[PDB]
Design a protein around this ligand. Structure first.
Ligand code: CLA
Ligand code: CLA
Ligand code: CLA
Ligand code: CLA
Ligand code: CLA
Ligand code: CLA
Ligand code: CLA
Ligand SMILES: CCCCCCCCCCCCCCCC(=O)OC[C@H](COP(=O)(O)OC[C@@H](O)CO)OC(=O)CCCCCCCCCCCCCCC
Ligand SMILES: CC1=C(/C=C/C(C)=C/C=C/C(C)=C/C=C/C=C(C)/C=C/C=C(C)/C=C/C2=C(C)CCCC2(C)C)C(C)(C)CCC1
Ligand SMILES: CC1=C(/C=C/C(C)=C/C=C/C(C)=C/C=C/C=C(C)/C=C/C=C(C)/C=C/C2=C(C)CCCC2(C)C)C(C)(C)CCC1
Ligand SMILES: CC1=C(C/C=C(\C)CCC[C@H](C)CCC[C@H](C)CCCC(C)C)C(=O)c2ccccc2C1=O
Ligand code: SF4
Ligand code: SF4
Lengths: 80, 83, 121, 63, 145, 38, 741
């Protein structure tokens, strides 16, 4: 599976979660930023590693990071 | 699809009668297409082992007959099936 | 008569690989006989020795050569694909009997095609 | 002599064909019962048919 | 560039026509015409309609190497997504073809990886590059002397 | 004033400056041809 | 129902927006922060349906932009006529068409480039032209420089009028959407008005000007001594001397005694033995027959008078039991999408350019074209390339339609929907056919190379070993040879001498003769079948999977043109429809390169050449095609190596520009590989270090340097690949054929 990590500079903009075509990510309550919420990656077993989440992340550098890992039927996006 | 193999019976007689009209003269005879085509097979099955050459007009009588027959029988299917 | 399903699956059902009643060996045998017979053709007529006295021998031996490679291929497929073993074709024991049928069939089919061309040269 | 005869017939046939062929004919014209647009359409067809037939029979040495 | 230079400089020296290199090497048409084109003649006549000679193997290798080089371009220019979509249709076809669909792949066929294709493309490129020049430098020199 | 802003756009000024430059070099080679040294 | 409706004074004529780069785009109007903006400005400038959501505003830009294109074409044509008038040996060439080389470009004496002013004859020095303008102008009856000058001035006036009309129909009188959607009216006018009256009015020129001028030229009258065209119109006795039917006037036309015009309107077939061109009396009659066909054809579609067909009713009527709703929706598709129309129109215009290439070499329509081998080779090759580019464009716009304009509601169980619903069956079968064709076409060459290299000539696919006779093509040649007096009773000669019958010579040079097809011809035809099927695979796959695949289920949302959907799913580089077009271009280049090489070699080997007093044909490459063109080594050695001799030996001669362009084009081709083989990540990182050095010296630009986009890298790559590859062949061909032809 791929590894998806959320770093503390997340501003809780929700753009990564909206961008994810596999529903890997969700917004969770968090006091660390003014938005009152942080990206979370609970379903990385479904992550294809498309990095649409990183493309969407406005922080410099990225608050969400995708480390491509061991390939599976799911991660390779295979319908056979 | 109703099928009805009698489409093939009409396809033969319908095309053959229309193709049996007398033509002008050259590389046909003046008899027609069928009368030339049925004469071409008669003088070819007479020499059953040794087939035709590219020079022979049999190949033209074959194509122009079949491309006319296939046209008349395909338009025969649509007519009977789709009234 | 549907054509797409009826005539298709009706024909396919009666092919040796699909036909009800046949042991894996007789399915193989029938498949072999059919393939061995036609496979000799290209080797006989277009092979390097086609204009020599060995035209037909070379054609037969080539076909047996190819058939051996196909049978080894069959055996490897079966060994890899079927860890489980049973009497049905899609199983270790059944696939080996099918392969045995195919090899006997195809060598015999090749041999039979060689016999007819010599009989009616 | 044969050219005017064939042309009038071809125009009169095209006019008769037109009454059945054309989608929604007029029937507000004294005798022909087609509007001007349809009369030009049918006579145009009658000319094409007439010229083609005439040239057909002329090529076959019939007229 | 290094080996072209070495070879042409030596061909000219060995022929006893140092003047050819000295005059032709100062412009690039000189290299294409007086080095590549001129010295190709023995190589590409290794075989021809009239027959073949001992350079046939270098002539065949030369073309083989051009083929391998050009095949590399496929992997270097066309990238993965094109191929994965095409393989999907082939997997579809196999599973829906009677008799064939009794045979099952154990490994799901996929397009080569992004990095893999760079490597496979580079290997074809490199092999073609090397074998082409090997066949030329050997056959051109062997054919000339 | 808008036409002058257009004529000040990168591609127009580049075209005109390189035209002028090319003209000078072409005209120098017309009047002083085959200058291999100073 | 069919009405003219325009909006007046819709756009003010102001330079304001000229001074606002990227005004047309909401994304670009704000101006650059990075160099990417500069590229984006150009990439997006004509993508009108990205600028605005209004189909009306897109339509109006298109109509006005079209006038811009015609204005430019008129400047170019005008240029060609003016260069003919002012800087050409055309007048001298008319008096010695076989001896003088056409030339209409003179270079200035600077840095020694006046070497390119070749000894072309006719009392000038200049570049030998291969456009066939002289043969066109001779066919048109042009005999003096005044006629060419006046055409050039006329061209500039048409260019001016096109510019006014483009300006006028955008700024002053812009037609409404409902004007543009009059497809029935448009087709009636374009069929009867453009093609019909074009052909009728041209037939008029031919009968009144071309015919009399060319008859006198062909008789050997001095072009200065020939009466000016208007004298043939004014003095009917002058015309009646040349074509006696002009005694009877127009009475035989109105009375249907059309056989009286047998002198001016013929069905001779074959070629003039004098000019090696089609008989102009055949061409005049062709254009009359075509004109009638088109004027009649353009009465098909219903406009304002009830009569005629509804194209909507026609499409919806063509419904059978195997194709669902059939052509339902396609009328809506083609009246609401410019891209759908551009897709069809490019496919057909491209395919037409290719048909033109084949018809023009084999039935040389212009006098002294057939034996001007440079022009014959140039015109075939040129029209092949234009055709290839247009067909790939058809793929691009078909796919743009699928991404931007396609709706499931319009295309519900119609032929388009049903195609998408078995795209896997379509692409799997075409894939298979490409592997079958590639193995059994290219494999025959590799088999042959191998057998020849192993000293096994008796094991080859050849005319002298294992023969692959194109018996169907051979059979069709025979039928076309037997046609005149038989299945074409009134035809005196074959449509083309390419099919059989006589060798036509003009002077000693072969105009046309039977093109015999053997094993080499069978093999290369299956290569062409192969390269076309693969190109179709790439472009069709692009269209059918433009919106989604199993890999990218939402591909339409990512758009037509996007680099990838990231390295996940194993890697998704080049999934976009745009990337299929990118790959399609290389295969089109591959396909057409082999077509024009097949043409060049076959014509030089088996057609073009000299016929002696004895009457023995000596071809340019002496019949080497049959035994050399059945191996790749034969193509490398007997074609590229042997025929490149002219371009590489061109230095210090008038053809030296071809030598330079040959190397220049190789350079540009190779340079392309930098873009195609690399990725912008490398380049952006390199630029960071270069930007550091500029920052250090306080000379870093405010417009931040960026590596080209991933897509632009590909666009630059394929553009330089094609420019380099095509220009290389151009230099090769022109140097070769101007030397040996
Ligand atoms: C790819 C196309 C191609 C083709 C058509 C040929 C053809 C040939 N090669 Mg060549 N060859 C090729 C490529 C090809 N070669 C390549 C790429 C190389 C590498 C350099 C060679 C190297 C080579 C050598 C060294 C030799 C040949 C030889 C031959 C000949 C005999 C081969 C043989 O016995 O096949 C066996 C063929 C089969 C077992 C079957 C072929 C496929 C069947 C017919 C398909 C039928 C499908 C059917 C229609 C489906 C119906 C299904 C249902 C409806 C019933 C034959 C003329 C030999 C020769 O002597 O030349 C005269 C020989 O010695 N070839
Ligand atoms: C763009 C820069 C440029 C510059 C600096 C010059 C400079 C000059 N031109 Mg040139 N000229 C140019 C472009 C230029 N020209 C172009 C583009 C054309 C083609 C339209 C000409 C056509 C031209 C002619 C016909 C003549 C000049 C002449 C001259 C010289 C006049 C003194 C001067 C050296 C004149 C001269 O002195 O040469 C005899 C002259 O007769 N020029
Ligand atoms: C990249 C390096 C390069 C260099 C160093 C040269 C150098 C030269 N070239 Mg070459 N050339 C090149 C690339 C190069 N070229 C390329 C890429 C091409 C193909 C387009 C050519 C094609 C070419 C031709 C066809 C010719 C030259 C010529 C020349 C000479 C020009 C002298 C001149 O213009 O008058 C003197 C100019 C100046 C002194 C400039 C003065 C600038 C201002 C006005 C001064 C202001 C006062 C402060 C000079 C030796 C010419 C020559 O005569 O060769 C011997 C010549 O005919 N070049
Ligand atoms: C056949 C070639 C052709 C044609 C007909 C057009 C036509 C057009 N261009 Mg395009 N353009 C072209 C080639 C062409 N272009 C090329 C090769 C490029 C480089 C990529 C561009 C880049 C480009 C940009 C960046 C822009 C245009 C724009 C336009 C539009 C408005 C131009 C105008 O009002 O000026 C009227 C023209 C004249 C009065 C004559 C020109 C006089 C100059 C100085 C010469 C018009 C549709 C503009 C637009 O608004 O589009 C939405 C715009 O911003 N074009
Ligand atoms: C004569 C003066 C004139 C003026 C002041 C205007 C002004 C305007 N036009 Mg209009 N227009 C005109 C003439 C004019 N137009 C003509 C003659 C046509 C017919 C082509 C049009 C058709 C037209 C269209 C279709 C559109 C406009 C638009 C506009 C607006 C933006 C234009 C822009 O940014 O272009 C600056 C662009 C250029 C200077 C490039 C012009 C390129 C020309 C046409 C072709 C170049 C030839 C060739 C390809 C060069 C190759 C060289 C080589 C180096 C490769 C602006 C209000 C646009 C708009 O959005 O308005 C709301 C718009 O969409 N115009
Ligand atoms: C007889 C009627 C007629 C004719 C001749 C044309 C011709 C043309 N139209 Mg069409 N058009 C028409 C009716 C006509 N149209 C009608 C009724 C509609 C609305 C339903 C359209 C809607 C339409 C659109 C939306 C477009 C066209 C376009 C075109 C051009 C296509 C490109 C081409 O082939 O250039 C061939 C070029 C020439 C033959 C040279 C220029 C010809 C000029 C325009 C005058 C021709 C007619 C004139 C009466 C000639 C007088 C002859 C003289 C001896 C007296 C072409 C000029 C396209 C275009 O490019 O527009 C600019 C385009 O986008 N047309
Ligand atoms: C010489 C260069 C080269 C070669 C050989 C290939 C080969 C292929 N391309 Mg590629 N392509 C190339 C350059 C090349 N391409 C470049 C530069 C690009 C970038 C633009 C592409 C981009 C591209 C696209 C986008 C597509 C292709 C496709 C194809 C396949 C076409 C179908 C086919 O004929 O398969 C059969 C194989 C051949 C014809 C090659 C040689 C066949 C030999 C002679 C016969 C068999 C030999 C035998 C099995 C060998 C045994 C030896 C072994 C035991 C040691 C084929 C595999 C298409 C495809 O996949 O179609 C289904 C496709 O869609 N290519
Ligand atoms: C052209 C021949 C096409 C024959 C297809 C048969 C044909 O014409 O049938 C056409 C047939 C007609 O269906 P309908 O009667 O419903 O058509 C009514 C129309 O008005 C709607 O399109 O439609 C089909 O079945 C779809 C085609 C599938 C065919 C699959 C094979 C396609 C590959 C063909 C390979 C040969 C190409 C040779 C080219 C030289
Ligand atoms: C043209 C055509 C076609 C095709 C065809 C085909 C495909 C066929 C095939 C066929 C075949 C493919 C056949 C085969 C056969 C075989 C055989 C007949 C064999 C046999 C054998 C034997 C007799 C024996 C054996 C043996 C031996 C000898 C020894 C020991 C072992 C064994 C016992 C095994 C179709 C129908 C589609 C359609 C119509 C037309
Ligand atoms: C080359 C060129 C040019 C030129 C052009 C021209 C010069 C043209 C012309 C043209 C023309 C000059 C045209 C004309 C036309 C005409 C027409 C189109 C007519 C028609 C008519 C009709 C259709 C008729 C009808 C009728 C009928 C049917 C019935 C009875 C009566 C009558 C006979 C009346 C330019 C400058 C552009 C530039 C570029 C190039
Ligand atoms: C070389 C290369 C680059 C580097 C090339 C770049 C950045 C383009 C170079 C820009 C040129 C040199 C134009 C810039 C010139 C300025 C406009 C200044 C002009 C000055 C006068 C001439 C007016 C990429 O960015 C790239 C991206 C993706 C895949 C492959 C590649 C690739 O191969
Ligand atoms: S896009 Fe980046 S900043 Fe926004 S919620 Fe996701 S990780 Fe946080
Ligand atoms: S290599 Fe380039 S095109 Fe391919 S997935 Fe990565 S970013 Fe996208």
């Amino acid at each position: 599976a791929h590894t998806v990590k959320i770093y503390d500079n997340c501003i809780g903009c929700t753009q990564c979660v909206r961008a994810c075509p596999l529903d890997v990510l969700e917004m969770v309550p968090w006091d660390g930023c003014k938005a009152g919420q942080m990206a979370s990656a609970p379903r990385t077993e479904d992550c294809v590693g498309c990095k649409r989440c990183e493309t969407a992340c406005p922080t410099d550098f990225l608050s969400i990071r995708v480390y491509l890992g061991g390939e599976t039927t799911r991660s390779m996006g295979l319908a056979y | 699809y109703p099928l009805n193999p009698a489409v093939i019976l009409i396809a033969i007689i319908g095309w053959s009668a229309a193709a049996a009209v007398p033509s002008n003269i050259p590389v046909l005879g003046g008899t027609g297409l069928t009368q030339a085509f049925l004469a071409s097979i008669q003088r070819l099955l007479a020499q059953y082992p040794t087939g035709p050459k590219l020079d022979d007009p049999f190949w033209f009588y074959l194509v122009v007959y079949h491309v006319g027959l296939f046209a008349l029988l395909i338009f025969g299917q649509i007519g009977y099936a789709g009234y | 008569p549907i054509n797409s399903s009826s005539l298709t699956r009706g024909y396919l059902a009666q092919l040796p690989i699909y036909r009800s009643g046949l042991s894996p060996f007789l399915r193989g045998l029938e498949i072999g006989m059919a393939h061995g017979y036609f496979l000799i053709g290209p080797f006989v007529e277009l092979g390097p020795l086609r204009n020599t006295e060995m035209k037909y021998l070379a054609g037969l031996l080539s076909a047996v050569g190819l058939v051996v490679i196909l049978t080894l291929g069959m055996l490897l497929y079966g060994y890899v694909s079927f860890t489980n073993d049973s009497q049905d074709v899609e199983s270790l024991e059944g696939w080996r009997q099918l392969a045995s049928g195919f090899l006997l069939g195809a060598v015999g089919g090749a041999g039979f095609a060689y016999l007819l061309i010599y009989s009616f040269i | 002599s044969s050219i005017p005869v064939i042309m009038v017939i071809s125009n009169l046939l095209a006019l008769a064909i037109g009454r059945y062929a054309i989608q929604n004919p007029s029937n507000e014209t004294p005798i022909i019962g087609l509007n001007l647009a349809q009369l030009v359409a049918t006579t145009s067809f009658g000319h094409i048919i007439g010229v083609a037939t005439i040239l057909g029979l002329s090529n076959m040495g019939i007229i | 560039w290094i080996t072209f230079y070495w070879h042409w400089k030596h061909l000219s020296l060995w022929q006893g026509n140092v003047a050819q290199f000295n005059e032709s090497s100062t412009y690039l048409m000189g290299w294409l015409r007086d080095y590549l084109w001129l010295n190709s003649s023995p190589l590409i006549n290794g075989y021809n309609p009239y027959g073949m000679n001992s350079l046939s193997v270098w002539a065949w290798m030369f073309l083989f190497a051009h083929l391998v080089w050009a095949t590399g371009f496929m992997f270097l220019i066309s990238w993965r997504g094109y191929w994965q979509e095409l393989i999907e249709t082939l997997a579809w076809a196999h599973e829906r073809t009677p008799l064939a669909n009794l045979i099952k792949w154990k490994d799901k066929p996929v397009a080569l990886s992004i990095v893999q294709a760079r490597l496979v493309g580079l290997v074809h490129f490199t092999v073609g590059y090397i074998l082409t020049y090997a066949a030329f430098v050997i056959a051109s020199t062997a054919g000339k002397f | 004033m808008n036409l002058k802003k257009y004529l000040s756009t990168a591609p127009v000024v580049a075209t005109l400056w390189l035209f002028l430059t090319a003209g000078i070099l072409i005209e120098l080679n017309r009047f002083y041809p085959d200058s291999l040294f100073y | 129902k069919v009405k003219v409706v325009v909006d007046r004074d819709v756009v003010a004529t102001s330079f304001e927006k000229w001074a606002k780069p990227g005004h047309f785009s909401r994304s670009l109007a704000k101006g650059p922060k990075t160099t990417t903006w500069i590229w984006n400005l150009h990439a997006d400038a004509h993508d009108f349906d990205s600028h605005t959501s209004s189909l009306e505003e897109v339509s109006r830009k298109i109509f006005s932009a079209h006038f811009g294109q015609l204005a430019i074409i008129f400047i170019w044509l005008s240029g060609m006529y003016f260069h003919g008038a002012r800087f050409s040996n055309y007048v001298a060439w008319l008096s010695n068409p076989t001896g003088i080389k056409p030339s209409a470009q003179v270079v200035w004496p600077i840095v020694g480039q006046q070497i390119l002013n070749a000894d072309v004859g006719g009392g000038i020095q200049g570049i030998q032209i291969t456009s066939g303008l002289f043969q066109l102008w001779r066919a048109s009856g042009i005999v003096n420089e005044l006629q060419l000058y006046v055409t050039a001035i006329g061209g500039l006036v048409m260019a001016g009028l096109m510019m006014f009309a483009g300006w006028f129909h955008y700024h002053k009188a812009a037609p409404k959407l409902e004007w543009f959607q009059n497809v029935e009216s448009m087709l009636n006018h374009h069929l009867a008005g453009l093609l019909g009256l074009g052909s009728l009015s041209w037939a008029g020129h031919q009968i009144h000007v071309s015919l009399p001028v060319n008859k006198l030229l062909d008789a050997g009258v001095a072009p200065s001594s020939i009466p000016l065209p208007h004298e043939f119109i004014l003095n009917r006795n002058l015309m009646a001397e040349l074509y006696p039917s002009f005694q009877q006037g127009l009475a035989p036309f109105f009375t249907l005694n059309w056989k009286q015009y047998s002198d001016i309107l013929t069905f001779k077939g074959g070629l003039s033995p004098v000019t090696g061109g089609l008989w102009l009396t055949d061409v005049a009659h062709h254009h009359l027959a075509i004109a009638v066909l088109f004027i009649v054809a353009g009465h098909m579609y219903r406009t304002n008078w009830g009569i005629g067909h509804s194209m909507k009713q026609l499409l919806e009527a063509h419904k059978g039991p195997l194709t669902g709703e059939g052509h339902k929706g396609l009328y809506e598709v083609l009246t609401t999408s410019w891209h759908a129309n551009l897709a069809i129109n490019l496919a057909m215009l491209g395919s037409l350019s290719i048909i033109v290439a084949h018809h023009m070499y084999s039935m040389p329509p212009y006098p002294y074209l057939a034996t001007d081998y440079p022009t014959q080779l140039s015109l075939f090759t040129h029209h092949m390339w234009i055709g290839g580019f247009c067909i790939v464009g058809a793929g691009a716009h078909a796919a743009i339609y699928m991404v931007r304009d396609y709706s499931p509601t319009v295309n519900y169980n119609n032929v388009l929907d049903r195609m998408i619903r078995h795209r896997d069956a379509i692409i799997s079968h075409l894939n298979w056919v490409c592997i079958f064709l590639g193995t059994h076409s290219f494999g025959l060459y590799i088999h042959n190379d191998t057998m020849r290299a192993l000293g096994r000539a008796q094991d080859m696919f050849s005319d002298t070993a294992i023969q692959l006779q194109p018996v169907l093509a051979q059979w069709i040649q025979q039928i076309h040879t037997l046609a005149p007096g038989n299945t074409a009773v009134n035809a005196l000669a074959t449509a083309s001498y390419a099919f059989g019958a006589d060798t036509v010579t003009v002077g000693s040079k072969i105009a046309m003769m039977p093109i015999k097809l053997g094993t080499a011809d069978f093999m290369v035809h299956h290569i062409h079948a192969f390269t076309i099927h693969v190109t179709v695979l790439i472009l069709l796959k692009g269209v059918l999977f433009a919106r989604n695949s199993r890999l990218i289920p939402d591909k339409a949302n990512l758009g037509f043109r996007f680099p990838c959907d990231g390295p996940g799913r194993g890697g998704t580089c080049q999934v976009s429809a745009w990337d299929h077009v990118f790959l399609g271009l290389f295969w089109m280049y591959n396909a057409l390169s082999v077509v024009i090489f097949h043409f060049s070699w076959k014509m030089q080997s088996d057609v073009w050449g000299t016929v002696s007093s004895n009457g023995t044909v000596s071809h340019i490459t002496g019949g080497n095609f049959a035994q050399s063109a059945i191996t790749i080594n034969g193509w490398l050695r007997d074609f590229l190596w042997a025929q490149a001799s002219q371009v590489i030996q061109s230095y210090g001669s008038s053809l030296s520009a071809y030598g330079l362009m040959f190397l220049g084009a190789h350079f540009v081709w190779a340079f392309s590989l930098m873009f195609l083989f690399s990725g912008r990540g490398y380049w952006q990182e390199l630029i960071e270090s270069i930007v550091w050095a500029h920052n250090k010296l306080k000379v870093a630009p405010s417009i931040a340097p960026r590596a080209l986009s991933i897509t632009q890298g590909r666009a630059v790559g394929v553009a330089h690949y094609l420019l380099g590859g095509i220009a290389t062949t151009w230099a090769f061909f022109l140097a070769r054929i101007i030397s040996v032809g």
